[PDB]
Structures are given as C-alpha cells and as structure tokens.
Amino acid sequence: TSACENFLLPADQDGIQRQVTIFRYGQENSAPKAYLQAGLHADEFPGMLALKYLRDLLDEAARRNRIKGEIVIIPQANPIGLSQWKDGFLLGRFDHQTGTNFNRDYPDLCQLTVEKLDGQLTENAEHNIDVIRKTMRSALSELKPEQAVDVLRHKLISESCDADLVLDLHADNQAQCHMYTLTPLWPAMHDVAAEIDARAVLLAEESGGHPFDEACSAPWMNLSRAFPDYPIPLACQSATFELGSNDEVDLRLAQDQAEALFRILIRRGFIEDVHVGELPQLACEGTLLEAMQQLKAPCQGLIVYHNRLGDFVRSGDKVVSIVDPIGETVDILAHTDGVLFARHSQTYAYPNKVIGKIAGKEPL
Amino acid sequence: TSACENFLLPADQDGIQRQVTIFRYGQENSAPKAYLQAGLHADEFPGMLALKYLRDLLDEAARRNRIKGEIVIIPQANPIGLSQWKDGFLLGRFDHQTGTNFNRDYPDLCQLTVEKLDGQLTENAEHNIDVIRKTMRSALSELKPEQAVDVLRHKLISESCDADLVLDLHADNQAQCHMYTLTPLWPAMHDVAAEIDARAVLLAEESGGHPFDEACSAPWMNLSRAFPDYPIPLACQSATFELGSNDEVDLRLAQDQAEALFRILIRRGFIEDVHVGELPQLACEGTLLEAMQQLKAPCQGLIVYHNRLGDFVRSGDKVVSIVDPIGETVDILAHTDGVLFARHSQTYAYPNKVIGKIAGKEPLPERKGF
Numbered sequence A: 001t002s003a004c005e006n007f008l009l010p011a012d013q014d015g016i017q018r019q020v021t022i023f024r025y026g027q028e029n030s031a032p033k034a035y036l037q038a039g040l041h042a043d044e045f046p047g048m049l050a051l052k053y054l055r056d057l058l059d060e061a062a063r064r065n066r067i068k069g070e071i072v073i074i075p076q077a078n079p080i081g082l083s084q085w086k087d088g089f090l091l092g093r094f095d096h097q098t099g100t101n102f103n104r105d106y107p108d109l110c111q112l113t114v115e116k117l118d119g120q121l122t123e124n125a126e127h128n129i130d131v132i133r134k135t136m137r138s139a140l141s142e143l144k145p146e147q148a149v150d151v152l153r154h155k156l157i158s159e160s161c162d163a164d165l166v167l168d169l170h171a172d173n174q175a176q177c178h179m180y181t182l183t184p185l186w187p188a189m190h191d192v193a194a195e196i197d198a199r200a201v202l203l204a205e206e207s208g209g210h211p212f213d214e215a216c217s218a219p220w221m222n223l224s225r226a227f228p229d230y231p232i233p234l235a236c237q238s239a240t241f242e243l244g245s246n247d248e249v250d251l252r253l254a255q256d257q258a259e260a261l262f263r264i265l266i267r268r269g270f271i272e273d274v275h276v277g278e279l280p281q282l283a284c285e286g287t288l289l290e291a292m293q294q295l296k297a298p299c300q301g302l303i304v305y306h307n308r309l310g311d312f313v314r315s316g317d318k319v320v321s322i323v324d325p326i327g328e329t330v331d332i333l334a335h336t337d338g339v340l341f342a343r344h345s346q347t348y349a350y351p352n353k354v355i356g357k358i359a360g361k362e363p364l
Numbered sequence B: 001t002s003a004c005e006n007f008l009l010p011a012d013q014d015g016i017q018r019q020v021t022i023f024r025y026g027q028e029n030s031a032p033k034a035y036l037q038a039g040l041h042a043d044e045f046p047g048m049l050a051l052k053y054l055r056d057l058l059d060e061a062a063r064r065n066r067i068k069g070e071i072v073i074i075p076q077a078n079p080i081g082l083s084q085w086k087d088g089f090l091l092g093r094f095d096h097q098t099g100t101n102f103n104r105d106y107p108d109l110c111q112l113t114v115e116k117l118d119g120q121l122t123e124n125a126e127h128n129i130d131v132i133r134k135t136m137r138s139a140l141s142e143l144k145p146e147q148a149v150d151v152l153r154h155k156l157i158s159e160s161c162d163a164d165l166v167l168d169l170h171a172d173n174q175a176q177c178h179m180y181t182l183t184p185l186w187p188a189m190h191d192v193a194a195e196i197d198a199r200a201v202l203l204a205e206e207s208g209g210h211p212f213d214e215a216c217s218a219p220w221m222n223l224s225r226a227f228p229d230y231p232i233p234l235a236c237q238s239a240t241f242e243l244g245s246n247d248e249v250d251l252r253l254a255q256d257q258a259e260a261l262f263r264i265l266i267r268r269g270f271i272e273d274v275h276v277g278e279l280p281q282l283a284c285e286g287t288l289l290e291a292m293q294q295l296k297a298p299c300q301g302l303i304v305y306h307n308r309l310g311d312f313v314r315s316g317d318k319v320v321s322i323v324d325p326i327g328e329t330v331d332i333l334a335h336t337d338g339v340l341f342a343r344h345s346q347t348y349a350y351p352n353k354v355i356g357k358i359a360g361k362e363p364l365p366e367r368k369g370f
Ligand SMILES: [Mn+2]
Pocket: A304, A321, A323, A329
C-alpha cells in the first residue's frame, strides 16, 4: 500500500549513476496532494530520520486504509551531495561538479507558463488551479536538462509544483527549529509553524537565486500579479523547516518531528478517522527576512559565543567575539532586538563568515 | 616577557608562505625544558584558546621573574591546515598538497642516532641524556625537507625532541578529555593526567605511522633496548591531551585547562615561588590502546546513539545504530566493558567510519598493529 520509485540520474564525471528514492502513500493525482522532502543539503540530517519515522506512521495509516490524498515522501532528496565526502567529512551544501548550491537555480514556473496561459483562465478559481497545474507539468515536460544536478532539481519540482502542501526539511549548522515561507502564506501556515514548534518564522516574497520552497509557492503570487483580471489563489503552500542543527540525529526528536508532520497531514485532510485536538501555542510571531541580522566575523579566529542558542538579545549586546589565539580579540554586537535562533557548529571564523542569526522586527 | 619567532614555511601551490608563531618564556637550552603545542590538526580548537590563556599566566610569571626553565608555547602549530577552507568548513586534519595526515610521518630519532651513538655512551645516565639530545639535534640538522608540511614537521620535532616535558594538545570530533602516552611513561605521568582530568589514559609503545608524541618519547625507550648495557632513562615525557570536542570553544573551559597546564608546569619545576598543593583524584586507570574498542559503521547512514558521551557501557549493550532513511537499520554493540569517552560530531556514516571509542581493560583480538 506504498509505491516506491527509484529515479535514475545520468552518470556524473566519475561515470556514477545515482538514484532518488521516492515513496507515495495515497491515490495517484487525487484528492489533496502533500510533498515532503529532506536532505536537499545532504549534510542536514534531522529531516532524513524524521521522514524515516513519518513513513512508519504512514505505513500504519495505509494498513488502516486512512490515507485520503497523495502523500509524497523523499527522505534523501540529494544523492549527489550524499556521496561528497572529503577527509572524512560530508560536504553536502554545494555540487562538486558545478560549484552551485543544491537549493538554488530552480525553474521559474511563472516565466515558463505566462505565455501558455494567455487564453486559458476564467472567473472560476478551481478551474484556474487545475489549468495552471496542468500547464506547469507540460512546461516542465518540454525541458531537457543534461547535468545530474539539473535533472535532480527538474524531477523534484516536477513532482511538487502541483501539490497543495510542500515541506522542504532542512537544518542549520547550529540552530533552533525555525521556518521560512512566502510572505503572503502567513498567517495561512500558522498551524504548520505551531505543530513543528518553530522559534522563528522568516517571511520573504523573493529571497536568493530561485530556491526550492519559493520555486513551488512564488509562481502563484507572480501569476496572480501577471493576470490580475483572474482569481489565482496561492494554491501551493510551501515552507522550509530548519528542524534543528545539521548533526542533530536523536531518536526522540525524529519521532516527535514525524508525529508533528503526521498531525499537520491530519489537519490538512490527508488522514481520516483520527482526532487531533487543540493546536499548540506558537512560540514566535512571523517576521520579515529583511529584519533578520546575520552576525559576521570581521576577521579569522576562534568563535567565542557570549549568548546561548535561543537567547533573546537586545541591540548593543555583545553576542560573540573572534579570538586570535596569537593575536587580538574583536567583539561583535546585536544591531536589533530578537531571538538568537542560529549560531554555528564549527567554532572558527574566516572573514565575513556568518556565525549567527537574530530574528528581529526592523523597528523605526 | 617572552621571545617570539615567526618561522617561515616555503610557498605552497598558490605561492603563499605561511608562518608558525613560537613563544619562549625562559632562558635558552636551560634547566628543565617544556614544550606545549596546539592545533597541529587545525580543526581542533580547545588547545588554541587554552594556550592563549596559559600565555596570560606565563606573562605574569615572567613579569614576577618566576620562570625556572625554558617553556616553549605554540598555540597554532599548523598554519597550513588553518587556511584549508572547503565549502565554508575548515578541513585541518590532512595536508591538501601531499594528502598526508599532519600528525603522521615524523622522524624516528632512534633510527637516526643509533649509528652516531655507537661509541658515545657511558655509566653516567645524565651524561647519556645530554649526549643523546646533542646527537638528536645534529641528526635533524643534517635533514633537508623541501615541502611545506615536511619543513613544518621538521621544525616542530627539532624544537621539542630535547624537552623534558612535551604536551601535544589535540581534540576529538566529540569526546571527553582523554590522554595518550608511551606505555612505560605510566604511572610517571599520573600527575599530568590528574591535573587535566583525563577520563581515559591510553597506552602504546608504537601506534600508527610515526605520530608527534611518540616521535618525542619513543626514541628513549628504543635506544634503551638498542643499548641495554647503558643507563638510558625516558628523558622526554610526552603525552597527547585530547582536551575535548574539536569545536569545544568555551571561556571557562580554556581558562580551567590553562590553569591545569600552569599547575603541571609548577609540579615539574618550571615556576618558582608558587606551591601547588594536593594532586586531584585520577578519574580512570591507565589502559592499553589494544584494549580500546573502535566502534565502526559497517555501512553508510544516520548515526543514532543510544548512549550519552561518557556513559559506562557493558559488553553486549546496543551503543549506536546506523539508519538508512530509505533502507535498513544496523545495530552496533559494545564488545568490552568501559567508558564511551568518544562518539562523533557529524552524525552520518560511511563504511568503516569510526563512530565511537570505549576504554576497556581486556585486550581485544582485532586491535593489533593500529
Ligand atoms: Mn575574550
């Protein structure tokens, strides 16, 4: 009662062909559609173990015949990064062959569909959703990527663009559970943030060079703006969950995160004959990404933190110092009030290294 | 206060010349000699901060004119590794240019001196120590390394081989404070182990491919065996201190470790007009390296630990599992009673990855030849 696909990438520079294993729990192309992936950055582990245990919960839901939609699970979304060992360490953030970030350069499904949708939209929002989703699938079918990493990105967006719910599971080098989403999907995804116990929710309409979560949700916002004459709702509700620290692999945590993801699926109509009960209290407000402070090391040296992970800090507070063991010490200050939701796992800096993050409000 | 030397390495593949900063607090070639280095593995930080604070303590001792010997301090013994960033991470264990481990392929000063010492030894132990140390310095003078990493290794052993006390400050990926020394320097270095609060003391006569600590202490043991007709004491007392986890950078800890290193220097006659007092409780017995179990991942996957760092584990206990999130789970057991003094910081495995260490007392059948 669970489908398993092993999608084969083309051979890399060493002639090695890698596979993306994809699990599907429901009725193909039916009902509501959910997409959950982990390990796009192959060195970010908590999502991998969480989806292993979410599978155990969905295996039971399938046996009890309780799966209402199509639920797509990819515990290891990036088998290219997962092979990239150097000197005994897994470096899973950048592609060795291209040097590019695994969570950048996704297709713009607005740019690829605006031409095709010219005469296809009506006053019926539900019609527009089905037309836009079919157009997106067609547009992607016409693309012929060659590099393993481009083929990987292509498959992942092909299997997620038409979903109602998309959770990209990530981690930071040393961080509290936090969430990113498209600004206008707040407060729509309050329930998701609450269930996973996010300690920061960071909002943007456009962030970097076309990341995966924005590749899924942004097109609905940009098409709405392209065709203001028609009802185009934000049909694909995507978010990035930073579930914790890159190396935070704990049995209890992964089980708790799997249970939270299961509760999210129940709340959004993927699981039948299960009572959830009261939504947990959200521990933070949604804030703009533009209001977040990156703490940067102005020089090389030891990273000495004066604040614990998750401390509420005030503008002017000494948060972290760079200590040259054969030289000088430099103090680095908070420039905004907020929560120090991220630091770093490797306590040595190079100049301009991001060594921490504070979720602020941008007051005036 | 102190002498400061900036020893220049030859230019690397990008034409960049790196320097090793060396501090000296005493006279020269004087009294007892101490050598302390940190960051030979450039991604191992606790020793770097500890020696910065040990310098603060020695600056004050120098101002008060209380340094009795020569004390040599190198907080960052490896400026080659310290530059080796890849994808925003510091890879400080292996040399990019040679592929070699920074703490391997040191000179065998027994092999380099046995020929020269043929007719130089007498019934006077103290004479033999001075003869062997002078011979070691000469033997090293004759060597002409060309590659930056070989020149670096050469300088570090040249400035440490003739020391009475050598502490090579290291860290492990995720570990409790623990110590390695030459088997016959146990119990001699019980005081050192006690002051640094080692939770494991691991003994070997020869470990891997010629590491630094053994390069300093082994020659005395091997020369004693080469010339059994003469008194050759273990003149150079070396140990490796794994001070904690690679990224364990804490003000309190570095200050506590600096204070402990200072107390070791006082106990061994390097600091005047300071009394130390009662030796702290030793937390563990000295055990053989061959009695230590390396836990190895038999396959790739998530590393899921069932035991906390520092837990006492029994033979047969499930300590760690390798979990393929799209496959099977494999359980890994303790095969000896002992303390799980090390695990690992990066909780994903490749086959044969060492993912933990248990300090046992019974020698294990598989642990021969390291
Ligand atoms: Mn400081």
